[PDB]
Structures are given as structure tokens and as C-alpha cells.
Amino acid sequence: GFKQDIATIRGDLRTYAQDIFLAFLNKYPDERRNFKNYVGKSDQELKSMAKFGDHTEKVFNLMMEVADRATDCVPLASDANTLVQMKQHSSLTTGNFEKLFVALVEYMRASGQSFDSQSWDRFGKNLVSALSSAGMK
Numbered sequence: 001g002f003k004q005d006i007a008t009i010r011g012d013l014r015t016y017a018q019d020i021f022l023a024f025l026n027k028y029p030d031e032r033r034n035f036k037n038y039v040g041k042s043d044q045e046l047k048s049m050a051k052f053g054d055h056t057e058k059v060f061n062l063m064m065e066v067a068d069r070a071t072d073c074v075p076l077a078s079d080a081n082t083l084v085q086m087k088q089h090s091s092l093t094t095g096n097f098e099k100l101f102v103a104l105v106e107y108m109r110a111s112g113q114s115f116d117s118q119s120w121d122r123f124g125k126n127l128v129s130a131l132s133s134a135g136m137k
């Protein structure tokens with residue numbers, strides 16, 4: 001289920017983080033334009049850039065912390081607060097996050113593995129509503 005998926009992802013975090021983030025950028029090319037340094041790079045070129053690996057891993061680490069602190073795929077209000085308040089996130093709307101979760105769920109469904117896709121979809125929806133409640137546009 002959702003809790004095991006957290007353990008699966010954490011076990012090979014940089015690999016999942018990279019593959020899911022690439023899926024996101026490839027499914028929504030306009031989102032790439034928010035990442036100036038990733039414009040004009042293939043998947044394999046990105047996977048050779050230090051900040052790409054680092055940043056995707058740090059993003060997914062925080063995702064997994066929020067996922068683990070959630071109850072029944074409902075994240076803590078305080079965690080939503082953090083994601084809204086981050087300087088790095090002042091440009092964002094909730095649509096950016098919805099898109100990331102759509103790509104994430106589609107990745108999980110396509111994979112050979114027994115991810116609880118439905119729970120991640122619901123976690124995504126609940127996080128987007130929590131971000132809105134914490135004041136994201």
C-alpha cells in the first residue's frame with residue numbers, strides 16, 4: 001500500500017526521483033521552462049548534471065517525509081505550510097503540483113510494480129487542497 005510505496009521509493013530514491021521528474025517534464029514541456037538549466041537537455045544529459053540529481057533527490061525526500069507524516073493520505077497542515085512558504089516556491093500555483101502528481105501516478109500505473117496508484121492520486125489531490133488551504137494560488 002501507500003506506506004510500502006514510501007519504503008520502495010526511499011530504497012532507491014534518486015532513481016525514482018529522477019525517472020518521475022523526467023516523466024513530469026516530458027509529459028508537461030511548459031513546466032521545463034521554469035528550470036532554466038534543464039532547457040535543451042536530454043534525459044541522459046540531465047542525469048549527468050549534479051544539481052539535477054541532487055535537487056530531484058531533495059524534492060522527493062521532502063515528498064516522502066510529507067507522505068510518511070500523512071494520515072490516510074491526508075498531509076499535515078504544517079507540511080502544506082512549509083511547501084507554500086518555501087522561497088523556492090513563490091512562483092508556483094497548485095496546478096504545478098497537480099501536474100507532478102498526475103505524472104507520478106501515470107508512472108506508477110505503467111511500472112511493473114504493485115504501487116498503490118489510487119492512494120497516490122488521492123494523496124496528490126489532498127496535498128493540492130492542503131496547499132490551497134495554506135494559501136497557494
Ligand code: HEM
Pocket residue numbers: 031034054055058059060062063083088089092096097100
Ligand atoms: C510535493 C511536491 C514538492 C516538494 C516536496 C518540493 C520540494 C522542494 C525542495 C526541497 C526544494 C529545494 C531543492 C533545492 O534547492 O535543492 C524545492 C525547490 C524548488 N521547487 Fe519544489 N517541491 C515540490 C513541487 C514542485 C513543483 C511542482 C515545482 C514546479 C513545477 C517546483 C519548483 C521548485 C523550484 C523552481 C525550486 C527551486 C529552488 C532552488 O533553486 O534551489 N516544486 N522544491
Ligand SMILES: Oc1c(Cl)cc(Cl)cc1Cl
Pocket residue numbers: 021035051052053055056059
Ligand atoms: O533543480 C530543481 C529540480 Cl531538478 C526539481 C525541482 Cl522541483 C526544483 C529544482 Cl530548483
